[PDB]
């Protein structure tokens, strides 16, 4: 499956993908990756304000993946996440935007020419950074209350949680994204396997 990753932000984004690695994307640049069928536990996310050396080692302000350019694992919150698993049950792809690990940059995650009623574009473009509750603010973004407060109410460790005032901050601004760990019904999208995708940072309206 092809994922076309485009930076439409006026600032530089260091794209990250597991699988895929990572690439510096100046404003307007694209990174195209191809991923094997059956790829699961996958994400794509933006990183802001990275400083890497010639060996590709350093630090990003948001979404840092163990101090390297080409990610071999997940990143540090706050980071807006495109999550997916391909060719799963009934050969369906399942994909979502998640804010459970916070928000750093606005995003569209969409199938190319999508087939099926739930095979459609997902967008989170509200000014979440600007509107972020002060208690949720972090360098470069807005953390989910689970990251900040670390209690069962927000983190759902026991499996018995629900929407909160803080999760609703996210959900009311980006209704199609996961806002807390058990936000499953109104947030998982599906396409037939074989579908290709785009991820756009700072998408136009």
Contact present, 6 and 29 (Cβ < 8 Å) = yes
Cβ atoms of 7 and 28 closer than 8 Å? yes
Contact between residue 193 and residue 87 where contact means Cβ atoms under 8 Å apart: yes
CA–CA separation, 119 vs 198, rounded Å?
A: 13
Approach to solving = X-ray
Spatial CB neighbours of 33, under 8 Å, sequence gap ≥ 6: 2, 3, 5, 17, 19, 20
Cα torsion 31, 32, 38, 43 to 10°: value is 20
In angstroms, rounded to a whole number, what is the distance separating the alpha carbons of residues 59 and 34? 26
Q: How many residues make up the chain in this entry?
A: 205
Gaps (C–N > 2.5 Å) in the chain: which residues precede them? Answer: none
Rounded CA gap, 142 and 148, in Å? 10
- What gap in Å lies between CA 42 and CA 165, rounded to an integer? 29
Tell me how far apart the alpha carbons of residues 8 and 97 are, in angstroms, rounded to a whole number: 18
List, in order of start, the domains of the chain with CATH numbers.
Answer: 1-205 (2.60.110.10)
Q: Which two tokens stand for residue 32?
A: 């195209």
Pairing state of beta strands 58-62 and 42-52?
antiparallel
Phi/psi class of residue 188: alpha, beta or left (left: φ > 0; alpha: ψ in -120 to 50)?
beta
| Preceding amide of 156 cis, omega within 30 | no
How many Å apart are CA 82 and CA 95, to the nearest integer? 7
Pair 190, 92: CB distance under 8 Å: yes
Short-list 5, 83, 16, CA closest to 46:
16
Token pair 């095979």 is found at: 119
CA distance 31 to 171: 29
Asked if residue 78 has a cis previous peptide bond (ω within 30° of 0), the answer is yes
C-alpha dist (Å) from residue 160 to 144, 170, 171, 198: 18, 20, 19, 34
Q: Which of 125, 118, 16 is nearest to 76 (CA)?
A: 16
- 120: CB partners within 8 A, 6+ apart: 110, 111, 114, 189
Structure tokens at 20: 């895929």
């Amino acid at each position: 499956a092809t994922f076309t990753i485009r930076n439409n932000c006026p600032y530089t984004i260091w794209a990250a993908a597991v699988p895929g690695g990572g690439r510096r994307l100046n404003s307007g640049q694209t990174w195209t990756i191809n991923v094997a069928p059956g790829t699961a536990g996958a994400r794509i996310w933006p990183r802001t304000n990275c400083n890497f050396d010639g060996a590709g080692r350093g630090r990003c302000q948001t979404g840092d993946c163990n101090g390297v350019l080409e990610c071999k694992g997940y990143g540090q919150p706050p980071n807006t996440l495109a999550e997916y698993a391909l060719n799963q049950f009934q050969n369906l792809d399942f994909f979502d935007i998640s804010l459970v690990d916070g928000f750093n940059v606005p995003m569209e995650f969409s199938p190319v020419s999508g087939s099926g009623d739930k095979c459609r574009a997902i967008r989170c473009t509200a000014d979440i950074n600007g509107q972020c509750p002060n208690e949720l603010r972090a360098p470069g973004g807005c953390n989910n209350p689970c990251t900040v407060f670390k209690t069962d109410k927000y983190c759902c460790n026991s499996g018995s949680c629900g929407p909160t005032t803080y999760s609703r901050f996210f959900k009311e601004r980006c209704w199609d994204a996961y806002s807390y760990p058990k936000d499953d019904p109104t947030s998982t999208f599906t396409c037939p396997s074989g579908t290709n995708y785009r991820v756009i940072f700072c998408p136009p309206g």
